């Protein structure tokens, strides 16, 4: 199917410390493969997936130089934005930046993006054409003017359509057994008396990859979602994910409810009923 | 409208001493680059800085060389101890992101550094002006003066012509490189020529005074000197002529 | 690494000049040409990203990323184009530039009215010393001299008398010995020329 490479950068100002905290992470699909943390002793971009450890010293010197340069830019952006909003130098503030590219099933370029937030809300963003910007407010409008005068869209377009996409393809091939490979969910149902007149059916999907998954409850074949809970998808810590969906039911009507599971690792969708 | 300012413009020094090169970037610029050019013929980047942090120093020699930027308007490149192979022109440049995206950077005038095996080799030039021939003035009605700067070492001289107390550029031609007075020697002394051409009638006016001026860069006051011979210090040597219709 | 032929290239005024460079590292994406006058800093002329051709007046720059070959063409060359030309390049992970070793270019001025002559000149001061000025010769009548026997001759240099519309070649010789005189001061290929008594 389609695949992504995304990098996430967070910078937090710290009044009374010398530098802001900067943290950078990169993913391919739902798999993390690198990190940088300004507070760690290494001061290098560091591998987090076995298949990037094979890249040589030129790769790691470059990635580290670039990611250190992003932290220096956010260090200045923190002071500029404090100024624009006339904020006290006493408070902690956040910048976040996310960019990357998607690629289709043919591995050709689908889309590219670049978003920037201040204190958890949209500040500036590249539109889908990769030639223009959306700005949230008058401070962002000033940056927009700056970035238009400096031709930042052109630089980024070239990276997103060239470099981003190419190295994504390259990471897909190296680590094929990790990234391309699919773990179907291991499933089961539990049952709980919640009262004297009611009972919970909980449908589990365990140990799957990737994380996209759809869990639904039908009653007598009729998709329905009243007194349903589906928990947020969660990492197991091994590179796999977990999720459940629950329904509260009249005591006795157990057999009438069915749990449907869709995951690209399943040949055909799975159906489950409470067994006894 | 000040560009990048580098100091000193010339440095002549004995091997073993500390050399300091300095650069003041254009104010407002946050990137600063140090390059080196030797007549092993091209430029090479030593290091660059951004916001005073060093970014890429792969071109830095592993030993004896150290660069700093202690504030946004000042960077230093130091060599302790200096060796003859360090002689070079060292250029400093500064820029901003948006100029660097079209590969524009602004270059200082450079520091020309000569580190010498031995200061006993250093000599200032002797300078002579020679006057137009009557043959030239009859055949062409133009008049050419020539200046010869001879016997200097090392190769740090700037020659200028002055008439009636103002520097001139019209009619002046001065060798791009200087001669070596014995080419088969390594540390040959050097020589240089320049010509000034003027109208015949301009030469024939006795109120016109022509001066050929050579600035030599050599030893400073903190260099030691023992020889029974004048200390070959940084200095100006000149020579002069007057017009005549006779 | 970058490969550039050092020259020197010597061409007549009005000629089209071609300078070029090769590289091996496929990560280079930006390509620049600089010009540098004798004893001065480099000045950017043209820059290219990725591939293609770019004209600016008399200059065209070209990049072929597949042959890893780049070029600069100068139409209608002039005396003031005489300089050393350096190419430089970088990728996207650093502002570090990699330079070629440069190509030296001489563009020889056109002279309408040659008038070659060797003149002797008298020392100004209270001192009787001699120097032979070879002047007014043609741009393509050049000096292969590096003469020992301790007569020195300087290579040629060109004066522009800016007041009037006048360009001129010249070169100079001297000797310590007063067993030396002007009309034999050149072994190299002169054309027949002026002298007087």
């Amino acid at each position: 199917g389609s695949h992504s490479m995304r990098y996430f950068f967070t910078s937090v100002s710290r009044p009374g410390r010398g530098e802001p905290r900067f943290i950078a992470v990169g993913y391919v699909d739902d798999t993390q493969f690198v990190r940088f943390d300004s507070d760690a002793a290494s001061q290098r971009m560091e591998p987090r997936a076995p298949w990037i450890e094979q890249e040589g010293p030129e790769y790691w010197d470059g990635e580290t130089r670039k990611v250190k340069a992003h932290s220096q830019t956010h260090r200045v952006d923190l002071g500029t934005l404090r100024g624009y909003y006339n904020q006290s130098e006493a408070g902690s503030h956040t910048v976040q930046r996310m960019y990357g590219c998607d690629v289709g099933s043919d591995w050709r370029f689908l889309r590219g993006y670049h978003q920037y937030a201040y204190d958890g809300k949209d500040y500036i963003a590249l539109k889908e054409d990769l030639r223009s910007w959306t700005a949230a407010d008058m401070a962002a409008q000033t940056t927009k003017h700056k970035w238009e005068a400096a031709h930042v869209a052109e630089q980024l377009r070239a990276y997103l359509e060239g470099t981003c996409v190419e190295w994504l393809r390259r990471y897909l091939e190296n680590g094929k057994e990790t990234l391309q490979r699919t773990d179907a969910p291991k499933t089961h149902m539990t049952h709980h008396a919640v009262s004297d007149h009611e009972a919970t059916l909980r449908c589990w999907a365990l140990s799957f990859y990737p994380a996209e998954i759809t869990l639904t409850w039908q009653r007598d074949g009729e998709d329905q979602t009243q007194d349903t809970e589906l928990v947020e998808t969660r990492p197991a810590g091994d590179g796999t994910f977990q999720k459940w969906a629950a329904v509260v039911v009249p005591s006795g009507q157990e057999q009438r409810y069915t749990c449907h599971v869709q995951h690209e690792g399943l040949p055909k969708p799975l159906t489950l009923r409470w067994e006894p | 409208d000040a560009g990048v300012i580098q100091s000193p413009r010339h440095e002549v020094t004995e091997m073993g001493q500390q050399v300091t090169l300095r650069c003041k970037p254009i104010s407002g610029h946050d990137y600063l680059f140090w390059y080196r050019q030797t007549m092993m013929r091209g430029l090479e980047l030593l290091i660059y800085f951004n916001n005073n942090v060093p970014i890429d120093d792969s071109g830095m020699p592993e030993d004896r060389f150290s660069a700093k930027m202690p504030n946004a308007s000042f960077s230093t490149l130091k060599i302790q101890p200096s060796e003859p192979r360090d002689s070079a022109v060292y250029f400093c440049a500064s820029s901003l992101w948006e100029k660097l995206a079209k590969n524009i950077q602004y270059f200082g005038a450079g520091t020309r550094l000569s580190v010498l095996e031995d200061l006993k080799n250093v000599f200032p030039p002797e300078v002579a002006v020679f006057e137009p021939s009557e043959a030239e003035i009859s055949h062409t009605q133009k008049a050419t003066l020539v200046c010869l700067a001879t016997g200097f070492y090392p190769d740090h001289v700037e020659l200028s012509w002055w008439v009636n107390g103002k520097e001139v550029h019209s009619g002046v031609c001065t060798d791009p490189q200087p001669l070596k007075e014995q080419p088969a020697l390594n540390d040959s002394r050097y020589a240089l020529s320049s010509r000034l051409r003027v109208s015949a009638t301009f030469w024939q006016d006795p109120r016109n005074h022509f001066r050929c001026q050579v600035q030599f860069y050599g030893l400073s006051e903190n260099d030691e000197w023992t020889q029974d011979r004048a200390k070959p210090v940084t200095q100006i040597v000149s020579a002069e002529a007057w017009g005549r219709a006779d | 690494e970058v490969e550039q032929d050092p020259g020197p290239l010597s061409v007549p005024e009005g000629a089209i000049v071609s300078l070029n460079c090769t590289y091996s590292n496929s990560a280079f994406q930006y390509f620049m040409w600089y010009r540098q006058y004798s004893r001065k800093g480099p000045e950017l002329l043209m820059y290219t990203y990725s591939s293609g051709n770019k004209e600016d007046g008399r200059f065209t720059a070209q990049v072929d990323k597949s042959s890893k070959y780049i070029s600069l063409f100068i139409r209608d060359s002039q005396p003031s184009d005489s300089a050393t030309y350096l190419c430089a390049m970088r990728g996207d992970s650093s502002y570090k530039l990699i330079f070629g070793s440069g190509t030296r270019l001489l563009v020889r001025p056109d002279i309408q009215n040659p008038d070659p002559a060797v003149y002797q000149l008298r020392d100004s001061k209270s001192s009787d010393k001699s120097v032979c000025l070879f002047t007014d010769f043609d741009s393509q009548t050049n000096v292969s001299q590096s003469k020992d026997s301790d007569v020195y001759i300087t290579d040629k240099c060109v004066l522009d008398m800016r007041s009037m519309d006048f360009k001129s070649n010249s070169a100079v010789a001297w000797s310590n010995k007063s067993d030396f005189a002007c009309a034999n001061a050149f072994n190299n290929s002169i054309i027949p020329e002026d002298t007087f008594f």
């Binding site: 470059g62 670039k66 992003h70 830019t73 500029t80 920037y116 700056k146 981003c164 | - | 992970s93």
Partner: peptide
């Protein structure tokens, strides 16, 4: 590969 050599200030 991250974008380089670097981003521009806001």
């Amino acid at each position: 590969m991250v974008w380089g050599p670097d981003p521009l200030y806001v």
